[PDB]
RNA sequence: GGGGGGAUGUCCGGGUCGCCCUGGGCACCUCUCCCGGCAGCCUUCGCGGGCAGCCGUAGUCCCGGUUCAUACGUCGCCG
């Protein structure tokens, strides 16, 4: 799907972008794809990072493998740092609550664990 | 000045027994620095003295001696009262100093005052804009804040002021410590009310969108988790909770992946910025070792421009001489390099073009 | 660059001279025959003999009697001796501070050194042992003559300054003695741009002599004092020390973090080097016993007395005046109460080999603090004079509040908010009044719950702002604050105000041509003792 | 190592090493992150060796595998520290249920 | 006063919530074991030493 | 009602503490005070206070009279000179000015 | 072999007694041999070691003039080229070593050098 | 193995403790076992927490299920809080490095990911 | 780093079409003052101030491509 990727990103496609993002072959596609198109991908996936932060299982692995196969593209053309610089502000909004997002779980996950016991009293009852 | 304030309090007592609330309130405006115009900020308020604050709250609020009294609005319609609300003078320390005479024998006065005061404010203001202003302006305790959120939830569970008040009280109880919130909230709530507050923050989380996917927080943290610790095991004795902890786990693993990739994109942006610096200097012609291929150097290292300072014994610093600077550019040179001179160099104007072998 | 020099006159006439000169690069030039070289328009080619050992400045250079040894000493705490007959060096290697001065006896017998930590040692030759020993207060001094290594632009230029008032406690059961924070030396303490006191000394007030000395943190008074890059060491400073009520215990806290110039690679995103060192802060607390020979001995050490996700800088410490209980507040916000117990695991009591049981302090109580955040806090605490109740100023920006907590139960007895106009500096508790200093000064009774005294103090720089400090007397109900008169420099004045408990008029107004560094209350009788940056001390007494 | 961070010469101590020397020091580090009692000092040294010998990981793949076997314990060192706090919350309000 | 050259004292590392006690190391320092079997592997009735 | 004690002690000045004749005593220089100690007991035998007072003035130099012993020339930043005699205190109340801009050094 | 060299003068006064004036590192390896000359107004000492670079010093103006690092490389360039063949040549103890460059510079004007 | 557990912990066994710890049936054993013995278990597993912090996959699940089946034992006898209080200090030594233990991985795991690419260039080569 | 200019080379509407320009992209040399330090020289005790100031970058006749490091007094055995 690497040529599909290349096509989509040099005409600025979103439907073809979504066709590639719905689907291992991720590794295959990014080691297939090219360099400045990987920078274009990085920019608009940052847009995605902002506009929809739900389950990240696919696309954050995708930017991993993007920086794997063609992370060295944007040192060889470094002038577009604001491609990366604009990732570089989203990340710390993305960690604000982590000052207490584990302080979330432990008081709550025990209350979880209390019903696991109150279940365990009753299915034998 | 003590005799002066005693005479002023006696004159205000004379105004009270004459029931001259208009002139009394104008004296209050003169002290606080009727029209009663407002500065449009909770912050920029003139500093007022504790004796006038304590006399004001003494006159406004009341108590009932039956071994358990109750503040009442002696002045339910009062610009002085809404000024105390917006300036944040309605603290438990303030009202205990106000009613030092009759609260000396009653216990649990923090719980009593912090429960009763927002209920009093709510029956004053059904629009509860005064309540949200109190929430934003006053130093609040845990019982005060949980009764405030209780009033907001019986109000809801022209439609945005209550939500802003919810957010403000969420920030403040996120600030408050866990133990006091847990004990006072075990006191003041019922497990069904805790379930409604739980669903409120569930909606808050899922509207922030951490579960609804990509490719289609401390506040709520402290609030939702501390309140369920408050209710504890006495409440429930299901699959609601099962799906609930499932989406909790989705959000957790999402944030973990987020920190992993936080690190990598942070260092990538930093190295790309230093690479912009180095390739700017290389286009200038300072002949630094930077990468040439389209792949990342395994060492995320760049050749910085030479520090013009030279550290000497013992800690003294003299500037680097051009001799050693040339020694350093020489060691930075590689094994094979094409170093083309220009005729602009030969006349003395421009610089060369350097291309070293990729090391 | 010439630092100092000495000469031997070659003699019943004056036939020649030989001059050694020492310079802050660490070098000695000795010129052999200047009179014969400059008696002869034209002169011959003169060239001194070079002698480089010291890395930092050399401070004091002299000749040995018949002049066979070039004796010297400087910053690096080594008394160095050039052999001058062969190519060897002989050194008395590890002095307590930088060698400020060297002088010679009339005979070749006795050397006398002045050492940078206010000290003087007279030795006899090839005995090298303390034959006459005198030490002083060893305080941080604003130097009249600034420094001898402040001439050639070191990486950190050492600046005569005082960034914090001095930490000191008069000993109860022996008010003639006082413990006070010191480093190995004054110039070494100020080197690195941070206060470096991994050391405490006890000093007699009835006869103003430095009695004794003992370390608290890790020290290396034998290892090298300067790193290889040229940076002198910053040491764990003894931040907080307050003495027990009984005369038997002493609890201290030390802080030590890396410098920014050393972190340098822990930066990932928004991690500044300040963030890196504020993570890599290391804060010890140590409980100590004291023997009647003024012996300071360990009983416990706690590495983590205030911990949340990262370590919490611990804010204040206070002693119960009736019991062996130490309360402390940190950045956790909890106040923790520590009492000494007997080491006994499972009935087996741990006795010292002489027979006495091993005592060890422990967190007897924990009290969390309710917070009121309106839309970088600091803590301060003081017990009552009777005990049973503790007062704790929690200290965010202007919204800040004091909390009174019982001791028999961990329950809060009172909460008083809005008594600080900014961040808190400190607070004391007299017999009935709380005497707190923020940007404001507020003396405020609580049995009447009523402010008695209030002062808007003079706005100054931040150094002077911190250097304002306060202490009560508690024998006669009178308190006192020390405050400089408006970046701090040498020509600077401070004033001390004596206040009684009941009024607002000052009971004694007196300024000082230098800035007084610390004030302390005598425990036996009324009055205080105050020590000043031009490092001298004297006591105020009523009557 | 506490001495060499306290007298600030860890960077000097590690900047002049060779292939086999960083093999040994990395082996010690990878052995001894897992103790939290000196995990801080160990990860300081780990940061430094990352700063100092990440360049020739492709030149010497056996050290890249050592660089990997750094991670190959660390990817379960996240799980030890995480499940710590997962257990760390399991205790704290069971204490609250006492009262 | 020439400082006494003392080498680096090791850090007193903290103790876990069950130290190995003095008596524990004592009774484990009862080390040297001889395992002497009885006649015909007789279950050992009684052993004695007087005062 | 409150009263101040005399400022005693002080920081030892970098000006050379000088030996005594017969090597039995040591004249050490503080700020505002010059102290002679006896070496055998290592104990003070005389502390001589000196009023310094004009912001930053200090003892600039101090020297034994080379002509007659037990005499001390002490000099400040502004030119004020004392000729006190240790084992005693005669000369502390009578300085002499030198009419300098700023007295930087002196040698007797 | 501390790559270091010192100079020493007779003490004024006392006969037969000398002392070091100073020392310094000039070379980068040891100083295996040396020779001194003082003639036709030139007082020098030549020092040779193992870093191949002779270092010469003034005697009468020692500490008055800078030294001189003679070229560690021989006087003859010992480099040859057939420019039509673009062959470069260098010989030492028994071998002659030849490199061919096979390309120009304007073609490249990193990975291919 | 619940009676095995009960036996071992009321005679203070370590070999029988190790026989139970070498081995689902964990859930079975702890819902089999008793209350004050669960407190004894908690104390000496805290000892284990200190003395050997390697792979936690078994015993930290074990203390989970301990607090599941008989976590309410030590509220019904609360006087031995130092059983729990001594867990309550080990946990925060156990999290010190987590101030930067994710700052560990991300710079390192990319360097991992770089060899995954430099492998991917070569097995096709 | 900014604010600005004179000048180098560049594409897209382009212009009678040439000098280049406006509208977008711009990288550089230069000048300009406000950023950080560093010096000297007068001033006042100092606190401070003033004065004409340089540098924030690159390869030299040689050449600072330097100079610099922390004690003896006593060891061994085994408890």
UniProtKB/Swiss-Prot annotation, chain B:
- Superkingdom of the source? Eukaryota
| Localisation per UniProt entry | Nucleus
Q: What is this protein called?
A: Uncharacterized protein CTHT_0071780
Protein's organism: Chaetomium thermophilum (strain DSM 1495 / CBS 144.50 / IMI 039719) (Thermochaetoides thermophila)
**Which section of the whole protein is represented?**
471 to 930 of 930
